[PDB]
Design a protein around this ligand. Structure first.
Ligand SMILES: Cn1c(=O)n(CCCO)c(=O)c2c1nc(Oc1ccc(/N=N\c3ccccc3)c(OC(F)(F)F)c1)n2Cc1ccc(Cl)cc1
Ligand SMILES: Cn1c(=O)n(CCCO)c(=O)c2c1nc(Oc1ccc(/N=N\c3ccccc3)c(OC(F)(F)F)c1)n2Cc1ccc(Cl)cc1
Ligand SMILES: Cn1c(=O)n(CCCO)c(=O)c2c1nc(Oc1ccc(/N=N\c3ccccc3)c(OC(F)(F)F)c1)n2Cc1ccc(Cl)cc1
Lengths: 644, 145, 645, 126, 46
């Protein structure tokens, strides 16, 4: 082929020297060329380049101020040179330009928006002093999607927030919340919005780090009862703000208000006599033993010791000393001592659901678990009373008919004991070693639940196939037992329910091989059934159950990367539940003229410190040894031209 | 027919990428079958060559490994290839390596070969499939959107 | 505390201005400050900055040769200044210094060694031109004797020194990497440093070989000193980077091969079908039509492969019931007569390769000891079968034979023998591009499992000892026609040490029940202790040891899989090179230099002089190439301004 | 204050014993990261640079007489037994110290070593 | 012991100053040195 030049022209033969004059820099020639071309001398001072650079767009490129002044002295077309100067980060050029179809920017980018994009303090200052106004975010779909993302990038710049916002803390919490929600309804631009939200969360952390005394810290968190803004930082999920070392040293002094086996004994001793402290809190709460259960650390231990005693009662309900077999029995001695705890739990949930009735209540795991456990306990209590008034009398247990209330009540009560002892897991966030382990093991669980939409599909398909094959050979002659839960397993694939039960117990290898035979000499269907069972055993344990452990490893690294701010956030949430008054008794029992000026002064000092730190962290860094070399020759140049 | 519903997972923002990444770490498993199929064939040949002299079907209603009293496990090549496949899941008992004779030398050799097959395929061959699938998922997740 | 300056003597008054003028580059100030010739106002020209720097050394670090020459003309003490200039890589300073107690360098360091360490082509050339010599690498103050030895081996193993003062840079890069590899095993402390010096010698040969411009020069190197005589030397020295180069690999593939997925397997099978035709064709008339068609390595490989699948096919047919019932001491069947030629060919090949290498680097390979064991088993099978025939006769029921009968032992050994034969078919995966790298990496992830076998073999022994000690007093065999764990009612799992060892092995796979821990007595304390020890053994092995064997086979598939294409290609080259010569072109069934030196040394100079150029003119650029642009502009401006006035 | 006391250029300049004052200053900075767990990554990172200072200072030995004098200051190998009590892992695992320890310890190929090992082990009562 | 320790400290400082001054910061010093030398020569010429 022959390579040619398509859709292009030539610039000039005399304007090349004029452009090279400003490319290298020489006042004499540059001035002369412009001066001699005053009376229509056909030089086209508004030149062009193969790169598309006009004369003005070249002096600004090299930042030479004298050349810019000389060019702007004459009548030269500027076009969009202001935006180029703003993007190039030249303060002198924009200062000169402020007081004085083909474009490289979309026709919506105003100078203020571009300056906010560049995130420069001085240029934004100059533009705001002149007077600007960004629009308010709220046919041409492509235009409209690159017209709200540009606005939110300008609004989320730290330099603009710290300069034209009454309260940078509030405007950082709410802005990151709006951006986070916008990332959902905007699936195409998901990565861009989520990065802005993480940008706004670090701004509050950086602004909080500029506190040099505990007095200044308490004025920020308690603004507008106690720790009022610290609770607001949790409603907006500001994990970085909460997990600041100062905000964690302050909370520790309110919480606590030594070797391991000098503290374990102390904890067990202080939890040994919780009823004494609870009684003293209600009979003589003045100093000695009435406000000793008011320290949050002691209150946490007392509440834990009551929960451990509740579990110890559930483990004594199965003892034989505490038991005849009669229909509708009277409640035993243990159940009367268990009833107060259940009533306390239900009442505590009732007096905590009023903040929002199912509104953000059922969002976390533990609230749903508590709701299920309380429903099960209510059903047990209802059934045990239903069974008392009608189904009374003494009769051997083996002669009872199924669905008897005394059996369903016991089954529901036994199911609810599992959830009661699994609530003891949530008390691990308070420990330094077992704390981060629980959070990592609880966030590496939404991935597991995504494999159970493929495993269930495979199970359903294979169960349907096996049942369709084997359902014609059902037999029930000379059999006391019928199912896979017998000594001699039979009828494993005779129905869809038993088929679904058999293909689940084969994961653990509890299904024998002879269940694939029939009471006939049909040796072709037996081989097909065995092949189906073997194929299921192949892709359930080698393929599908090895890709589950292969993706846990590649998602645990991401979770464990930032897994210490989350544990501290969870621990702070747990701690702050024991600070407020109300609910200080265990389940066994209980059944602005000023202050707006100091805050402003502290906030302005914080903003001053933040800007004085950001300018030095951005200007200096390896760029400090570049401006020095300019000065080194500038001083010599001035000295030389003084003598010349 | 019911296994084509997984092809509709490429419409959900959560189950979508999982299916695509799951079907890409599957040509690696296919390359690993060519070694297991050779080890299985070698050990089946050895076990059948040792045990084919002791076949018997006297006074037994069933014959093979798929009945309650497993017998004639290594009498032919088909039953030997089936017996070494079900031993991965532990569904083959240990009394199938016996004969109706007092030949303890051949029984010990058969048991040793069965144990050697168990070691190779369960702790040396199924731990290299995990190790090489765990180091191949990271590349698939770099370009999965 | 009241911090003070301890162990520091002083400085002087005047010398500070001297050093400041030297550092700032003021020529006139230093010139007048040096003019106290032989009448000095107590100003020491050998003053030492508290940091150790001297005026001569300061000028070296600023490479201002005017002050350097002025100081040299004034007889300033030099000391170890040449070494500093060499390390700083200043050509002019070395040039000037070459024509004329606290030390910063080790006492055994010489300028040539330091220059070789810095790898500077110009300084090395200048030093060699004047006449130098490295000591002989070839015990009282062992600290400096081991340090001196490492200094000289680091100088010799340098690309710039090797290709300026070596007769054959290709041959000296092979012996040097080999010697440094075996020198890292006698010096365990400095192991990490010797084996890195060896790695840069292997890459030097590959880089030098990569400068070939056409196939004419490439084949001149590989054939130096019968054919491909310098490609068998690289394999002998394990130069994996040199061998696995695209230019060499393409030549090897052209020599080997001499189509799509569905069109290649079918024709390979078709060619393999007529295996016995073009072997007798070669035997009778070695002509270009058929006799020379087996001489193509790709065809010989297929014929030698299709001749092995035939061995396995009738190996599977030797156990069919159709083909010598239960007769004591039988005559060989119709299949083993067909088996005998292949076995005899394998044994003859092993015998002929035994004396060709002298059991050194021959038994040192994974795939060459399995062959020895297999052939020993095949020989013992015959040795027992012939003994059975000559001393036994008569048809006797099999159930009545006494144990250790020669027939049973012979057939057991034969059954064990033909497992290795089928497992040796694994070594034919290196020829495939898909299964090749996978198979090579699997065999290197298996020498780490062998280390996770001294922990398990000790845990097993420790627990078996305790279990046998507990349970050896309750053994019984009355009312039991069957004894041992290998029956339908396991009864004596932990009675003897031999039984205990093999009862804790099957428990890993879950084939040992729980009632084996009971006794025929109501001693619930002993039974509970035995069950607790069995459970503790199950926890340690199946949860701890076997979950960290997979966790250390995952931090060893990131290093092995890092460089896997080189290892696979080296193995494939070693496989290909065995089908190039004459002598082995017979399946076991059918087996029963004045001008050359001139040309070589002429192309070698071109290769070396291209490598040095492509090294210097790439080390210069690899930000640095534009730093000298500003200095060039400054020098031009200075010269112009000075010359104008 | 601890970030200043643990600077290599100040220990060298104004300490009587840069070895001893780097063992102590790294032990305190490790047990102080447990009482100040809020500032934990800053107190233990400050302790990991005090272990490398001693290693880099011992790395400057030139002969086997200088190395022998240091390790036997204040019976034998007194300084090395002190560096073990403070858990100085980088100080002990140095090629020169390891070479000296091996020379004191031992005072061939794979197939020739275990043979004489068993030979010596058989006659352990003799 | 003191005689050995003084040498150890001195040669540790001599190496740390090298590794800090040199380590492309070395290239920036040479440019400034050339500029200063040119400036001084020009000032001393006129
Ligand atoms: C599905 N099936 C099956 O039901 N029965 C029982 C039927 C009677 O009850 C088998 O005996 C069987 C089988 N498959 C087999 O051969 C494999 C083995 C493993 C495979 N794969 N992966 C792994 C992965 C990890 C560990 C082990 C294996 C595989 O690939 C596959 F298609 F994906 F299954 C195919 N055999 C063995 C056999 C018997 C007779 C003959 Cl003539 C030929 C083969
Ligand atoms: C292959 N085999 C086998 O078939 N039977 C059944 C025959 C009887 O029916 C065994 O009983 C047996 C065995 N091997 C054994 O001892 C081991 C075990 C594991 C080793 N290694 N690794 C692993 C890795 C992962 C899981 C399990 C094991 C190992 O490693 C070695 F020392 F290098 F050989 C040696 N025993 C037990 C025994 C019997 C007699 C004696 Cl005197 C000594 C020991
Ligand atoms: C060793 N043993 C055992 O032999 N028998 C059988 C004896 C009779 O057949 C047990 O029944 C048993 C047990 N151990 C137990 O409790 C654990 C479990 C796991 C532990 N550890 N790790 C792992 C690791 C991975 C997976 C599983 C477990 C552990 O160790 C501990 F951490 F120190 F506690 C202790 N029980 C159950 C039991 C019975 C009676 C009582 Cl009163 C209390 C408990």
């Amino acid at each position: 082929p022959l390579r040619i030049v398509r859709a292009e022209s030539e610039l000039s033969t005399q304007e090349k020297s004029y452009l090279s004059a400003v490319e290298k820099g020489d006042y004499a020639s540059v001035k002369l060329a412009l001066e001699e071309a005053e009376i229509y001398f056909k030089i086209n001072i508004n030149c062009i380049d193969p790169l598309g650079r006009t004369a003005l767009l070249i002096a600004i490129e090299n930042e030479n101020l004298e050349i810019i002044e000389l060019l702007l002295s004459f009548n030269v077309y500027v076009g969009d040179a202001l935006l180029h100067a703003i993007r190039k980060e030249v303060v002198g050029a924009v200062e000169l330009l402020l007081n004085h179809q083909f474009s490289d920017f979309t026709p919506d980018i105003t100078p203020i928006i571009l300056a906010a994009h560049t995130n420069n303090y001085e240029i934004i200052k100059m533009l705001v002093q002149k007077g600007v106004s960004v629009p308010q975010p709220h046919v041409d779909s492509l235009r409209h999607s690159r017209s709200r993302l540009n606005i939110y990038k300008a609004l989320a710049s730290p330099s603009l927030i710290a300069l034209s916002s009454e309260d940078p803390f509030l405007t950082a919490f709410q802005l990151s919340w709006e951006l986070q929600e916008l990332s959902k309804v905007e699936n195409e631009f998901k990565a861009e919005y989520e990065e802005l939200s993480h940008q706004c969360k670090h701004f509050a952390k950086d602004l909080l780090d500029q506190t040099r005394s505990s007095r200044e810290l308490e004025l920020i968190l308690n603004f507008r009862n106690e720790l009022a803004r610290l609770k607001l930082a949790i409603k907006y999920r500001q994990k970085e703000f909460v997990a600041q070392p100062n905000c964690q040293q302050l909370l520790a002094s309110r919480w606590y208000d030594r070797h391991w086996a000098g503290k374990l004994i102390t904890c067990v001793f202080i939890g040994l006599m919780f009823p004494l402290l609870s009684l003293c809190y209600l009979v003589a709460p003045k100093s000695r033993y009435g406000l000793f259960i008011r320290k949050p650390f002691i209150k946490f231990i007392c509440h834990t010791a009551s929960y451990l005693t509740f579990l110890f009662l559930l483990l004594l309900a199965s003892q034989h000393i505490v038991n005849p077999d009669r229909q509708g029995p009277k409640p035993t001695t243990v159940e009367w001592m268990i009833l107060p705890w259940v009533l306390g739990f239900i009442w505590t949930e009732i007096k905590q659901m009023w903040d929002g009735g199912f509104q953000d209540y059922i969002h976390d795991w533990w609230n749903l678990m508590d709701f299920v456990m309380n429903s099960l306990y209510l059903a047990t209590i209802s059934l045990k009373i239903v069974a008392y008034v009608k189904y009374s009398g003494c009769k051997p247990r083996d002669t009872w008919e199924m669905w008897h209330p005394t059996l369903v009540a016991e089954a529901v009560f036994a199911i609810a004991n599992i959830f009661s002892s699994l609530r003891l897991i949530s008390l691990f966030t308070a420990n330094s070693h077992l704390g981060p382990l629980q959070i990592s093991l609880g966030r590496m669980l939404l991935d597991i639940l995504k494999f159970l939409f493929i495993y269930c599909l495979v199970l359903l398909a294979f169960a349907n196939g096996l049942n369709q094959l084997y359902f014609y050979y059902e037999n029930s002659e000379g059999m006391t037992c019928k199912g896979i839960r017998c000594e001699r397993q039979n009828n494993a694939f005779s129905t869809l329910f038993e088929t679904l039960q058999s293909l689940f117990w084969s994961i653990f290898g509890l299904i024998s091989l002879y269940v694939t035979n029939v009471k006939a000499d049909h040796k072709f269907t037996e081989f097909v059934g065995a092949t189906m069972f073997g194929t299921y055993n192949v892709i359930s344990l080698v393929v599908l159950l090895n890709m589950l452990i292969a993706m846990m490893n590649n998602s645990y690294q991401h979770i464990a990367d930032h897994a210490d701010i989350e544990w501290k956030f969870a621990r702070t949430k747990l701690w702050m539940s024991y600070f407020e008054e109300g609910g200080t008794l265990p389940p066994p029992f209980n059944i602005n003229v000023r202050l707006n000026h100091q805050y402003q002064e502290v906030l302005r000092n914080l903003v001053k410190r933040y800007v004085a730190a950001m300018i030095r962290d951005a200007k200096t860094e390896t760029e400090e040894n570049f401006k020095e070399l300019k000065q080194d020759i500038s001083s010599f140049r001035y000295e030389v031209i003084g003598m010349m």
